[PDB]
Amino acid sequence: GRFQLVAPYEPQGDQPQAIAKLVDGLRRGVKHQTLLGATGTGKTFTISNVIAQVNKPTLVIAHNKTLAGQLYSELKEFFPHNAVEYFVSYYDYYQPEAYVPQTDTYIEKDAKINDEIDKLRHSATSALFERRDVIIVASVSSIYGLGSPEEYRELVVSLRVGMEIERNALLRRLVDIQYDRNDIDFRRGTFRVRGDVVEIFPASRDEHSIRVEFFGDEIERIREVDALTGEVLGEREHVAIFPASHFVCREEKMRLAIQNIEQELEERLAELRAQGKLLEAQRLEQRTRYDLEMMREMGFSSGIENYSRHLALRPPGSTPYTLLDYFPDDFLIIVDESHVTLPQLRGMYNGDRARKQVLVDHGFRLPSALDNRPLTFEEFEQKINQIIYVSATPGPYELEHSPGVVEQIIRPTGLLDPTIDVRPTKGQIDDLIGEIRERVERNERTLVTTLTKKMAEDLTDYLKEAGIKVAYLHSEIKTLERIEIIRDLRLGKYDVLVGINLLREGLDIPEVSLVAILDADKEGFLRSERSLIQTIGRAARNANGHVIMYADTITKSMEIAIQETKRRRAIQEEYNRKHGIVPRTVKKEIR
DNA sequence: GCTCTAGATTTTCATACGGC
DNA sequence: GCCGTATGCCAATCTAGAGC
Ligand SMILES: [Cl-]
Ligand SMILES: [Mg+2]
Ligand SMILES: [Mg+2]
Ligand SMILES: [Mg+2]
């Protein structure tokens, strides 16, 4: 395939040079590069240009699913002729199996699956074999266990007009790859028959079923079919039907796997019983033998993922197969918000290991359950072909592995990194209150950041006493109601929002002209250099953007952020001067 | 170095049950 | 043994500080 970028506009401002640097580094074979793109500079359009120029299948990794969704929307509009795909957790809810020693409690695994997300997951994986012009937006789900891509590929049922194959032989192979017959409710992951037509709804597709028409053992035709109404659509010459699960469990391997699980259990029970952990072994035997009977009286068992490694016959310690393995060897990775996303990726292994080791220590699971896991960060490193880290505040790992940075600060809209004032703590709430009132005069909103949920709630109350319209925003408030609070800020219900750590990455509020950082000098994660610069960027979407940092000293963290903001402004002033640009505030749609 | 602390996101091969 | 349906808010992750 071949990527076709589609937009009205050309690259502008800093975008051209940025695109050129990243493309040349990629072509020279450089492994790690870093796009130091300041906020609201059109970072998704820049990276799309790179993808379009180098024409490699690409994985965009995001640290959260809201941002994941936006990237996926924007990229769908930029590449409407290409396979833009989505790959995140497909669980409506999920609690893992866990044991909590401090409160001596076992917690059952509970789950519930979202059908749309599973459909997208299958569209994503199948796309990577059907064609080369694929971009997948993904969460850290990308580093979790799937079945091997080789097995996933060889189980495909490939069909072409002219083929000779027994009607029932197709059907019986479809069942092998996890499809169900269903003449009543014809939906994805199911098939049916209507005389000569064998109608197949692939696992990757919402509304568009295949219709394979037979004459004896021949295939006279194949047809994509709109299943909203029932009408027929275009007539293909071939089609590929991929498995309706990323996990194969065939009996041929399962028989030996059972005796391997059987013999790991013996050894572990002897181990536990020897150490006077008699309760633990009784636990381990009761679950393992029950699961093993289910494994003999059925294909499945409960918690089957715990026996991943045995059921695959792969050795102890094995690195799992993942989405990354489904990509070609010359693929490309974009890491969105790398300073937050990479630490998250690092820690997926740690938390999973922690949780599973206590299950194993208390005899809920065998030691081989540790091999059912995500990648370690080191295993992620070894699977990188080439990678681009995007962030306004790139972290240590990105800088240390990249040959300097591609800097992109000039915004196509000419908006400046705001000015910053530093004021004393003496009489700070009154100074702020008056400064908010001037903003309410100009119909401009304000963000205030404190250190705690308690302080954010107390200031909201106190600002209500002063007659200011205001809400607090922190993580006690569920996602749905946060969307609504932010919506209601823009419409004008509130002139102020008080927060802690939800007022940085991916918050475009054009109406905000003031950002108030309280306790600006209290050293810690909330007032580190990066979180400081990220908070400052909330005021860079409005032409009268301003920052007040209340503090009595100026920390090292404060002085780097002040200096790097000033420098960025000065460069943006000069570009604006050269081109006669007067900064204009962002007109963005509500909802 | 170990053990707290604050406010943050993400992830994880559904399953027990009653009525057939 | 098969199948349709009601069901949960239950962990350990991160950074970068503070006491020892
Ligand atoms: Cl979506
Ligand atoms: Mg499934
Ligand atoms: Mg491997
Ligand atoms: Mg590679």
Residue numbers in the entry: 3 to 593
Sentences from the paper on this structure:
Within this complex, UvrA acts as the initial damage sensor but hands off the lesion-containing DNA to UvrB and dissociates, leaving UvrB bound to the lesion in a preincision complex, the precise nature of which is not known. Both UvrA and UvrB expend ATP to form the preincision complex, which is believed to require threading of a β-hairpin element on UvrB through the DNA duplex. UvrB presents the lesion-containing strand to UvrC, which catalyzes hydrolysis of the 5th phosphodiester bond 3′ to the lesion and then the 8th phosphodiester bond 5′ to the lesion. UvrB is classified as a member of SF2 helicases on the basis of conserved helicase motifs (I-VI) (Supplementary ).
We therefore introduced a mutant Cys residue into the hydrophobic pocket and disulfide-crosslinked the resulting UvrB(T251C) protein to a single-stranded DNA substrate containing a thiol-tethered nucleobase, a cytosine. The complimentary strand is designed to contain two pyrimidine-pyrimidine mismatches on the immediate 5′ side of the modified cytosine; these were introduced to destabilize the duplex in the region expected to form a bubble, thereby facilitating maintenance of the helix-penetrated state for the β-hairpin. As expected on the basis of the synthetic crystallography approach used to trap these structures, the 13th nucleobase on the inner strand, a cytosine, is extruded from the duplex and inserted into the hydrophobic pocket between domains 1a and 1b. Though insertion of the β-hairpin loop requires disruption of only one or two base-pairs at the insertion site, our structures reveal disruption of base-pairing throughout the entire 6 bp duplex region comprising the crosslinked cytosine. Previous DNA-bound structures of UvrB bore only fragmentary nucleic acids, leaving uncertain the overall disposition of the DNA duplex with respect to the protein. In our structures of a lesion-mimetic recognition complex, the duplex runs along the entire long axis of UvrB, contacting every domain except for domain 2 (Figures 3a–3(c)). In agreement with previous EM studies, the UvrB-bound DNA contains a sharp bend (~60°) localized at the junction between the bubble and the fully base-paired segment flanking on its left side (“left flank,” Figure 3d). If so, the observed contacts between the helicase motifs engaged in DNA binding and the inner strand phosphates suggest that our structures obtained in both the presence and absence of ATP (hydrolyzed to ADP and Pi in crystallo) represent “open” states.
